[PDB]
């Protein structure tokens, strides 16, 4: 007997290890700024920044911002490790 | 294994739901699957409205039944896929297919009485009737039909 | 409506060869008679509609299978009539 | 033990099988009908419940499909008479007589023959010299019960569903009086002479009597006695069974010609209003020139036959009885522009058609009324499947009432009469409106008999 | 009661002559209806003497009973046409409705 | 219960009784009788029936379908009824075959 | 007892205070079939209905008001 | 031994031949259901009710009571795969007193006479043939004491009981 | 006037309960020889079915109320689950209801009674029919 | 059994996604519940 929450009402997942680990480590809940380049267009349906959280070590696209280049990178590199537009630190 | 679904989607541009049906068969054929069928099942409404991931009551939604055969680890791959899936408010899966249900609970004696290929074989529409489905219509696909059929407009057709 | 008494005819026409077929001695004039039969009411395969005089051999079949059974030599092509049936 | 042996005898000589030759089952019918009561008194007879042998000798004659005839007589001991001594040998005369029947059809084994006789000959033996003993079936009861549970002739129709049927017919000039005194005491009193023969046209009863009338008819004259029908059947039983005859082949040849015109035209129906003997020439005049109505592009309609060269709205095009063959290529020209036209309305007809039969049935299962007539009234095809739209839409709103005696019907304005169970509406109605007023009589009821126990 | 084997193609025979009837054919208005089903009984048992196939064996007999329909309902509309063409006599369901909505109408205008 | 389970699992036929009606059948004809009477190509009498006395000769497709039954059907089919699509009970049966056919000493 | 009889439609409708007949804009030719209401049993609520709900309690009572689409009337 | 199931049966005779005293109702009849209810549970006795609102075989059941009772009257009760009728007839054997005989032991009482029309302790007085007879022409015959009768209605108590 | 109209038309005496009904009498008759496919619909996609075993709000009867096959009862409490699950019954009510019910009374009465167990427009059909006969 | 092959999915999602559309000649059919849903008039855009 154990009880589930559906984070975003797609992800089943215990409540506990839930409310400790998954819900404050959502990508668009811990970095927004870093969800706002999500590609959108590149990149699968079944993800999206409401879902996949920080620590994905499988790489994603990634819209720039700032010279709207499209770049694919992990998302662990993206926000934890600090990473960065290939393009943007070319400039 | 033969397994069925029922997809609840939010109903978005057709070039969006195709994209979106398109990556679900594309994961069912990439992991080593087939599809029995597909058939899109028109738009309804819901008894109970599901709130979309913006966290919105939608009325409105579009009705996809899938039937496929997968092995068990990579359906539930795919399984994944379609609940976390953006559009589908809900999926159901039919796991009573290759046995009907109520026999591993219904009687002892007839538990290992049934023929699991009879049901395999057969497709979910057959097996679960929908309500205007009835044995009529299968012994008109029996009958030929054709010149019995052609006489039935004749005595409101004069009047 | 021809098909029914053709099916018909050619029942009586086989218990009649059953008969003539008694004590035939020779296997060529039984081979040959026996292979008329089945161009002369196109019995092959390729007439699957009501036209095929087999479906209506409900027991006559079965003799006529029998009947061209005895092959033991000087086949010339013998065994496609079997094969045919 | 005989069971092989008599049904094999029935599927050969049986009547049902002999629908060719009308006179070879007229003898059959006859002669099973004969065997059939001959062998129920036999056995009533040996049961018990003596009684005196119907045509205590007679000959009886069957017709066989070599795909031939066999005559057996049944000559009872001279000295019979109802008890116990002649008990016995009553049986061994019938087997006799349905060995020798069963003999001359061929189809009884030489060794069962023998097998029966030598039965026979040992019960005529132990008769002089009683004996004692302390089942199987004989050919008495193999017979008769073969004879009664598969192999039966179909009962004779009844003048209830007779005269529903139709095949009664009377002249007007009799009075209704003067008409229906001939049914009262001549079907409820006199159904049982009715030959077998005679049920399968239609009679009609006028002031003359003959067979000269309507296709497959018979005339019967204002209160015919018995045995005078039986004289007049017995003096032309060829003119019936030849008008039967060629009424039957009256009817089968525009049935083939409409078959194998509807096939080579890829159309449904041939429809008739107008004589047939009429509609046989334009059949004809079909039948040679239809790879011109192909040319002409004249397909995928079911086709009536009118007396006034037209169309109707439905995609039915209705033609006339008089036609030649040179003024119809005219015809065809002036016709051939719309075509189209009502071939699309022929679908989109046979569609509403459709969609209306669906929404009635749906009405009928789920708020049962015991009757729906929307095809009385002639309205638009669309108005009544409106109708049977809205009546479909009210539904389970009016499912909580029983409507098994009331009918709903199509009118041209509303009328509910819950004393004749009538309910007429129009085809635009209001759902609503009609579940308001049925809410509002539910309400005074309601109301009525809480007033009514207050008061008390 | 019935044998086993002959009330289970019985059941069939009915279930596909209902179809052949009141469905495509649309004739709920047939007449001595036991005629064509024991005759069709009685073909199906020909046939199985001989070995016909029994799916063949009904589909025969279900043409020839549909067959026989037509021709019942194709001589019924021929005395029915002619009938009504000769206006001297019509039939006996009219005149019992004639002289009942007569009386109906009468009491009307009465009231 | 478990008896009738693993004689099932073991024996083709064993379930199908002269009658040619199991038991879920005569309570539930509509799902057990094919809806469909096909005439399309009834296939003839098994020959190379020798092969397979039970179950366990043949594990390499779903309900121990040999091979040369599979001979006309498509591929669809055919891929359908692989071990891929195997269910896991059947999995573990190969498995169980595979130590009785190493191990075995008789049919 | 069945009620009484009616068989005018203006006599109904003088009679009840609702036309039967629907005698509005003809929409003919529609879809050749209709879908259902979820809750067909139901009864129609109209559009011009005021919804009042009165709740009670051992020492206190409750009354509101609201319109056909939800919105509260009166407090 | 096995697992528990409630009974049905699309034949009466099934129901008769399995339960003691069986009662079938509907629940638009509540108050008759209630007094039969009344009298067998006061001579207890155990009894089955059936509604035949939702159970199944609805039709076949209906028409099976009706045809046996010769009567559309839903609520009936049976005893001994016989027909004891509906609420009158079971007021009447209550009357008579002959209901409890026929729910313990299953037979009405044919002796003859009543009993529940008694001054004191149940007798034959009054029994005996009379010679002639001519028990009217004894115009000073003793006739009894002076029964009273109401001279109005006195309104009944409860529209039910 | 129309004159196919008069030989299409046929005119009966009294209506049927659908039009059918004899054939399908007779046929029964003769299949008798006188002289349940629900398991099949109990699913998810058979609201009406489903809603035939439930109570007016949704959920289960008495056993002895509503008594049912095992089989029968564990496909409707899964038919029932599985149809709310999706959306095609609601979590809480029961439509279908009335026209479930069997014992329903008349529109004038307030309780079902066991006791229970020629048109002017007819009329004017066959005045029309016979004017055009002549 | 008329399988979906690979080549054959996009074109089959495509024509099934045009079932209930709009402005249609040949009646629409009923759903797996046999009720008739609404049309779209393309791109499931509900209109009607
Ligand atoms: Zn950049």
Not at chain 4, 13 to 25: A, E, G, K, Y
Not at chain 4, 250 to 264: K, R
């Amino acid at each position: 007997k154990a009880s589930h929450i559906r984070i975003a009402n797609r992800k089943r997942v215990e409540m506990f290890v839930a409310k400790r680990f998954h819900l404050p480590t959502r990508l668009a809940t811990a970095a927004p700024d870093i969800a706002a380049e999500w590609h959108d267009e590149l990149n699968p349906m079944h993800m999206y920044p409401a879902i996949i959280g920080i620590g994905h070590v499988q790489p994603v696209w990634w819209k720039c911002a700032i010279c709207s280049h499209s770049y694919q990178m992990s998302v662990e590199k993206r926000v934890v490790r600090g990473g960065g537009c290939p393009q943007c630190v070319v400039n | 294994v033969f397994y069925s679904f029922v997809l609840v989607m939010k109903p978005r541009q057709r070039r969006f739901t195709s994209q979106a049906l398109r990556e679900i068969g594309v994961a069912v054929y990439s992991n080593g699957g087939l599809i029995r069928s597909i058939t899109n099942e028109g738009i309804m409404r819901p008894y109970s409205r599901f709130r979309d991931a913006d966290n919105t009551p939608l009325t409105y939604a579009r009705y996809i039944i899938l039937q496929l055969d997968m092995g068990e680890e990579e359906m539930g791959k795919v399984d994944k896929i379609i609940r976390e899936h953006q559009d589908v408010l809900m999926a159901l899966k039919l796991n009573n297919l290759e046995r009907p249900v109520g026999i591993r609970s219904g009687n002892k004696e007839l538990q290992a009485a049934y023929f699991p290929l009879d049901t395999f074989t057969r497709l979910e529409e057959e097996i679960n009737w929908s309500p205007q489905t009835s044995a009529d219509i299968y012994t008109q696909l029996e009958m030929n039909w054709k010149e019995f059929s052609r006489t039935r407009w004749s005595s409101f057709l004069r009047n | 409506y021809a098909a029914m008494e053709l099916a018909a005819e050619a029942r009586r026409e086989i218990h009649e060869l059953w008969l003539s077929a008694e004590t035939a001695l020779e296997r060529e004039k039984r081979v040959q008679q026996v292979a008329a039969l089945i161009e002369k009411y196109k019995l092959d395969p390729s007439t699957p509609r009501e036209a095929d005089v087999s479906r209506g051999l409900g027991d006559a079949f079965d003799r006529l299978l029998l009947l061209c059974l005895p092959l033991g030599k000087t086949d010339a092509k013998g065994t496609d009539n079997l094969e045919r049936l | 033990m005989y069971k092989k042996a008599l049904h094999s005898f029935f599927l050969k000589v049986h009547p049902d099988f002999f629908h060719h030759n009308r006179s070879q089952q007229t003898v059959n019918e006859s002669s099973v009908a004969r065997l059939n009561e001959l062998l129920s008194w036999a056995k009533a007879f040996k049961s018990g419940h003596l009684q005196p042998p119907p045509s205590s000798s007679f000959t009886l004659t069957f017709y066989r499909k070599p795909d031939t005839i066999i005559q057996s007589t049944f000559e009872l001991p001279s000295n019979f008479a109802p008890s116990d001594n002649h008990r016995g040998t009553v049986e061994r005369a019938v087997n006799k007589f349905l060995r020798d029947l069963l003999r001359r059809a061929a189809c009884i084994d030489s060794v069962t023959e023998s097998i029966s006789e030598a039965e026979d000959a040992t019960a005529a033996r132990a008769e002089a010299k009683p004996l004692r003993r302390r089942g199987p079936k004989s050919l008495l009861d193999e017979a008769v019960e073969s004879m009664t549970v598969q192999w039966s002739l179909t009962p004779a129709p009844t003048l209830q569903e007779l005269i529903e049927a139709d095949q009664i017919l009377f002249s007007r000039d009799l009075s209704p009086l003067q008409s229906a005194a001939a049914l009262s005491t001549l079907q409820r009193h006199l159904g049982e002479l009715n030959y077998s023969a005679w049920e399968s046209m239609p009679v009609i009863v006028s002031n003359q009597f003959s067979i000269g009338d309507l296709t497959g008819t018979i005339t019967i004259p204002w209160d015919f006695t018995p045995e005078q029908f039986h004289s007049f059947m017995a003096h032309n039983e060829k003119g019936v069974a030849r008008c039967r005859e060629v009424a039957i082949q009256y009817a089968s040849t525009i049935e083939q010609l409409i078959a194998e015109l509807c096939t080579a035209l890829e159309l449904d129906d041939i429809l008739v209003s107008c004589s047939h003997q009429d509609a046989l020439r334009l059949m004809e005049l079909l039948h040679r020139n239809r790879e011109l109505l192909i040319q002409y592009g004249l397909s995928k309609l079911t086709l009536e036959v009118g007396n006034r060269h037209a169309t109707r709205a439905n995609g039915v095009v209705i033609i006339n009885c008089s036609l030649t063959s040179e003024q119809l290529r005219p015809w065809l020209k002036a016709i051939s522009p719309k075509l189209p036209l009502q071939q699309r309305l022929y679908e989109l007809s046979k569609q509403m058609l459709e969609s209306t039969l669906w929404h009635l049935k749906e009405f009928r299962t789920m708020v049962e009324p015991g009757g729906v007539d929307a095809f009385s009234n002639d309205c638009t095809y669309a108005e009544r499947l409106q109708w049977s739209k809205e009546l479909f839409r009210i539904g389970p709103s009016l499912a909580p009432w029983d409507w098994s005696e009331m009918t709903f019907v199509l009118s041209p304005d509303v009328d509910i009469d819950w004393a004749n169970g009538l309910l007429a509406l129009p085809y635009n109605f209001d759902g609503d409106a009609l579940v308001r007023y049925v809410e509002e009589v539910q309400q005074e009821a309601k109301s009525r008999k809480r007033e009514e126990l207050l008061a008390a | 009661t019935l044998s086993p084997e002959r009330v289970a193609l019985r059941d069939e025979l009915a279930r596909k002559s209902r179809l052949v009837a009141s469905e495509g054919m649309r004739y709920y208005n047939i007449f001595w209806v036991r005629k064509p089903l024991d005759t069709m009984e009685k073909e199906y048992y020909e046939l199985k003497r001989r070995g016909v196939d029994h799916g063949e064996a009904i589909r025969k007999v279900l043409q020839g009973f549909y067959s026989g329909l037509a021709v019942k309902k194709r001589v019924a509309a021929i005395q029915a046409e002619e009938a009504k063409l000769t206006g001297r006599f019509i039939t006996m369901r009219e005149a019992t409705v004639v002289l009942g909505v007569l009386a109906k109408l009468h009491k009307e205008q009465l009231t | 219960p478990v008896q009738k389970k693993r004689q099932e699992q073991m024996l083709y036929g064993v379930n199908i009784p002269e009658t040619r009606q199991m038991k879920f059948e005569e309570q539930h004809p509509l799902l057990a009788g094919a809806l469909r009477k096909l005439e399309g190509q009834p296939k003839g009498f098994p020959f190379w029936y020798r092969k397979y006395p039970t179950r366990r000769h043949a594990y390499e497709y779903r309900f121990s379908i040999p091979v040369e039954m599979l001979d006309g059907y498509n591929d669809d089919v055919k891929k359908a009824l692989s071990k891929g699509m195997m269910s896991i009970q059947e999995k573990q049966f190969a498995q169980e075959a595979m130590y009785m056919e190493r191990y075995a000493e008789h049919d | 007892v069945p009620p009484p009889r009616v068989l005018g439609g203006d006599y109904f409708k003088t009679r009840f205070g609702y036309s039967l007949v629907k005698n509005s804009e003809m929409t003919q030719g529609p879809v050749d079939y209709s879908q259902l209401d979820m809750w067909g049993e139901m009864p129609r609520y109209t559009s011009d209905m005021v919804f009042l709900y009165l709740v009670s309690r051992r020492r206190n009572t409750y009354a509101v008001a609201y319109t056909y689409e939800g919105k509260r009337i009166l407090n | 031994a096995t697992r528990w199931l409630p009974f049905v049966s699309s034949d009466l005779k099934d129901y008769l031949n399995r339960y003691w005293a069986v009662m079938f109702t509907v629940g638009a009849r509540p108050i008759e259901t209630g007094h039969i209810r009344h009298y067998v549970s006061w001579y207890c006795t155990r009894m089955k009710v059936v509604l035949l609102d939702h159970h199944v075989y609805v039709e076949p059941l209906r028409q099976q009571l009706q045809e046996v009772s010769r009567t559309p009257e839903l609520p009936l009760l049976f005893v001994n795969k016989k027909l004891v009728g509906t609420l009158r007839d079971v007021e009447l054997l209550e009357r008579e007193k002959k209901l409890k005989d026929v729910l313990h032991f299953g037979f009405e009482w044919r002796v003859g006479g009543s009993v529940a029309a008694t001054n004191g302790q149940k007798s034959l007085m009054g029994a005996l043939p009379a010679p002639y007879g001519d028990a009217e022409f004894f115009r000073g015959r003793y006739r009894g004491p002076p029964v009273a009768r109401p001279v109005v209605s006195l309104p009944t108590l409860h529209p039910f009981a | 006037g129309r004159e196919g109209w008069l030989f299409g038309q046929q005119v009966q005496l009294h209506y049927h309960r659908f039009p059918d009904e004899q054939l399908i009498t007779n046929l029964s008759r003769w299949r008798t020889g006188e002289t349940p496919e629900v398991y099949m619909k109990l699913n998810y996609k058979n609201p009406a079915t489903i809603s035939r075993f439930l109570t007016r709000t949704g959920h289960m009867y008495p056993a002895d109320i509503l008594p049912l096959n095992p089989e029968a009862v564990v496909k409707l409490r899964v038919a029932k689950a599985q149809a709310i699950r999706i959306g095609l019954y609601p979590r809480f009510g029961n439509p279908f209801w009335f026209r479930s019910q069997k014992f329903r009374p008349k529109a004038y009465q307030e309780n079902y009674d066991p006791t229970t167990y020629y048109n002017w427009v007819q009329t004017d059909r066959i005045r029309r029919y016979f004017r055009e006969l002549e | 059994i008329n399988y979906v092959p690979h080549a054959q999915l996009r074109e089959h999602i495509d024509k099934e996604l045009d079932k209930y559309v709009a402005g249609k000649n040949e009646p629409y059919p009923l759903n797996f519940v046999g009720q008739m849903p609404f049309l779209e008039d393309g791109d499931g855009n509900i209109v009607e």
